[model samples]
Target: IVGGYTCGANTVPYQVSLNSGYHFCGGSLINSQWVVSAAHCYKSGIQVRLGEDNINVVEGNEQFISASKSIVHPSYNSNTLNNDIMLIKLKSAASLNSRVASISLPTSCASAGTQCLISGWGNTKSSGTSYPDVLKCLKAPILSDSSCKSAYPGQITSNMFCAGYLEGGKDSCQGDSGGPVVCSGKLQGIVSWGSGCAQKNKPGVYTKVCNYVSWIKQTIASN
Candidate 1:
């Protein structure tokens, strides 16, 4: 995350690193056996690492579980980046503890100006290569839909929302995609996309999680 600080050990217990051989994206553990991430992050042979604070170290509290299945949103549009959410079924259930747990889905949509917490291990620099080894977090307020639409013109969609400082500074970057944007302690959004990582007038765009609660439940139920 850009302009963010390293998170304390197990500070964001529900956070998970989506990895094949290395960390590629961030995800949230929504249940004992399911992880929610961005469809863009989906790939074969993914391993979900729970209770991970530092990716470079072998943390004893961490749980490395392989993904048994990945289900991207059926109507997901890669071109427009709509409905970017995806669910990954773990090969085995994660053991809940102080260092690992599931986060609750949002009960309601987050309104404009709602301050939310976004955590990830994404790049800290807007340009150049500088990814963090430890988890980082930043607080950004939700932008009004009208404001978001204005910023990106026709690019903004109903399934997406914006959050961050309009003047630019703090925001999620690459490798943060599929990470959680928690509002009022509930999973409200998923880090999806943006314009150049925290650039002025280009706030971080996220998948509106509230819009897919039913889809999530239905998919989980059927699978």
Candidate 2:
């Protein structure tokens, strides 16, 4: 269907990265203040970077930012994947560069095949191991609500939406957890689930962005 769902296919919506060792799917600069990312993306206050492309930045370059506060969803349930999201209040905002800009988020009309995008410094191919470096990009077709219900048959809860190949879960991979699934240039989903790294009949799943509209608003407001 696509030329190749390999790592780093989509363009850099914005320069984004995560801790040195971990991988992330999305990052957003909300009005040059806060950084919006999935809750799972924050763990050890590891070093993060947001760049137009991974191959361009260096250690001394102005492409990295260490986080100060990593906030996960209040009611995040790892097992159930409920409220699986988070935000990182950057210690300092990213510098504005030609390749760097703020990404957006969507509140509604974000379902299966909804024309979305995903990016990360994850594995291009599933080797049962995490990719050491470089960001990967993939298109996320919003999973139809009805199809999600039918495919999941009560397993796919309301907290998340389905994306990736209907018969193949190869679009996203490990280390991509807690990344963004942008739709129409707006944040629509958060990388959340997949049966395996890139297995068949186990497409990549994401946390529904719309479900957290209120939570995001309130969380940002209170913070």
Candidate 3:
């Protein structure tokens, strides 16, 4: 799915690698120091690619950030997918441009009627899959507590938030995990899981970035 807005990007965005060459999803340029993403997105041979459209976008305007270290949430349980977040420490800070970037964290917490920005290359059609060679983006309205609670009563938690189509048409699916679900120009959530790629009854579920604010702050400080 894609968003309606076609404006200039604040930071030249790019994606991190998973399982050597696999493009699991995209992440944010948190600062000169870190790249925030989901924990499960990490596998062997993981790396980061900046300013590229695809793996084959070798000729595209792009840069690279080789990770010197990666840190996942201490509570993360890969088996159950809990604590599903992580940060990558770049070997060194890189410069910036429209094609090279780092993103700002959300300063305003989302409430009702908040507009969120989401992106990925997965599950545009209910049964379709990701392009694996293109990045797709979309804007979704932030769900009210009532709406989210009613829909995912049992699964919802403070550490988790919900997004995607409340009516269930657009969503983040397989291969989209670890991406951002940003609201108010901040990281509100991360693409974790959904009921299905595009099922009508269930919306996409995410790891609540809000809940991780403290953990993130502390982790960064301790680092």
Candidate 4:
């Protein structure tokens, strides 16, 4: 994230490092055996790191697991970025502790103007040199759908929402996909895409998790 700061350990236990040979994306632990991330983040060789604060080195709290299965949303559209959500079924259940836990999903949509926080190890700049070794965080305001639509005409869909600063700066960038946009201690959105990193008037777009609650539940039950 641009203009973001390092997050303290255990500040967000559900935040996880999604790796494929190496850490490349962020995710949230939804339950002992389930992880939620962006469908666009999927590719071959994907794995997950739970209870991790830093990606460069392993910590005692970290738990590595292979994904037994990955489910991309049925209606996921690669071109439109619609239904950009995915679930990873861990090969084995994660062990919960002070450094690891699940984030609760919200039942209703998040209201505009509500302040929320996003954490990740994504690029700090649009053309940044390197990704952070430690987790980073930033606070953003949830913009009204109309405001978001104005910023991203023909791109923002009902399945998506926006959050960020209007003046440009401070946003989730590369490698942040699938990360959580948490509000009131609940998983309200999943970082999906953006026009650019913290561009003026262009806010960060995310999958509205509340809209996919039924699908999420059904997928987990069936899988």
Candidate 5:
């Protein structure tokens, strides 16, 4: 994430790194056995690493678990990138602790101007390769639907929302996809896509978590 600082150990416990030998995406622990991420990050043989802060060193608090199943939203569109959410069922339940826990799903949509946090081990540069070993976080305010549409004409959907400074300087970048955007202690969005990292008038777009609450619950309950 651009213009963000490294997070303290255990400070963002719900954050997880989705891996296949290396960190490719970020996800949030929503329950003992389930993780919420972006459908675009989905791949076979995914390993979910929880309680992770740095991707380089061996953090004793980390728990490595394989995904038993990955369910991408049925209506996910690669073209428009709508319904970009996905749920990963862990092979085994995660043992909750100070360095590992779940985040609550949002009960309602975040309104415009709501301050939210976006964190991950993604690239810090808007262009080129500058991935962070340590998890980085950025404070962004939710943008209204109209404002989001203006930022990405003919692309913004009800399933998506925007957050960050319209003037630029801070935002989530590549490899941060599927990471959490927390608002008021609840998971409000999932880092989905953006025009560019921290570009003027091009805020980071996210999967609106509130719109999929029922779908998430129904999928978990039936599976």
Candidate 6:
């Protein structure tokens, strides 16, 4: 992520690494057996590593679990990326500990300008080659829908929201897709996509989590 630093171990218990032979994206543990991520992050043979801080090696606290099922949102659009959200069910329920826990889903829509946290192992710079081994985090402010609309024109939708600095200092980047965007200790968004790593006035776009709360509950219930 642009202007991010190494995140502390266990600081983000809900954070996870999505692996399909390699760590390609981040995910959030929403419950013991369920994880929330961007639909675009899905791939065959995907698995999750919980309680992990670094992506390159295994840790004593890490719990590598296979995905029993992966469900992408029915309305996910590759063109506009609307509803770019998904749920992954673990083969077995994750074991909870000080270093592993689920994040609460938002009960209401987050107000614009809220200071939020975004964490992942994405690129450190816009055109950087290296992806962080350790998780990185940034404190970004939620942008108003109007301002986001101004930035992306017809691209910003109600199912998507933006967060970052207008001058382009901090934001999520490539390989950060499907990560958690937390505000007030609740999950408000998922790292979806962006125009670039951190371009001026181009805040990172995220899948709005609150807008899918009911769908989340119903999906878990049905399965």
RMSD of each candidate relative to the true structure = 0.7, 3.3, 2.8, 0.9, 0.7, 0.8
For residues 148-222, could you state the per-residue lDDT of candidate 4 as single tens digits? 999999998899999999788889998899999999989999999998798899889999999999899998998
lDDT of 5 by residue, 146-217 (tens): 899998999998899999988988999999999999999999999999987889989999999999999999
Give per-model TM-scores. Answer: 0.99, 0.83, 0.85, 0.98, 0.99, 0.98
Candidate 3 structure quality by residue, lDDT tens digits, 1-223: 4222222333326433343566666676677667788888775456676665555557656656678777888888776566789888777775666676565665546776677777765445666553545566677776776777787766666667667676666666776677777776678878887666656667777787877777777877888
Model-by-model lDDT, in order?
0.94, 0.64, 0.67, 0.91, 0.94, 0.92
In model 6, what are the clashing residue pairs, if there are any?
none
9-36: candidate 2 lDDT, tens digit per residue = 2256464666555444546555344666
Off by over 4 Å in 2: 1-10, 13-15, 20-26, 55-62, 130-132, 150-153
TM-score between candidate 6 and the true structure:
0.98
Indicate the worst ten consecutive residues by lDDT in candidate 4. 125-134
Query: Over the stretch 79-170, how does candidate 1's per-residue lDDT look in tens digits?
Result: 99999999999999999987898999987899999999999999999988699889999999999998999999999889999999889888
Give the better candidate number (1 or 6) by TM-score. Answer: 1
Please give, for residues 1-223, the per-residue lDDT of candidate 6 as tens digits.
Answer: 8899878888999999999888898999999999999999878799899998877877778999999999999999988999999999999999998899999999898999899999998888887557888899999988898998999999988999999988987889988999999999999999998888788888899999999999999999999
Residue 166 in model 4: lDDT: 77
TM-score computed on alpha carbons, candidate 2: 0.83
Candidate 6: where is the Cα deviation over 4 Å?
A: none
> How does candidate 5 fare on TM-score?
0.99
In model 1, the worst 10-residue window by lDDT is: 125-134
lDDT at 132, model 2: 42
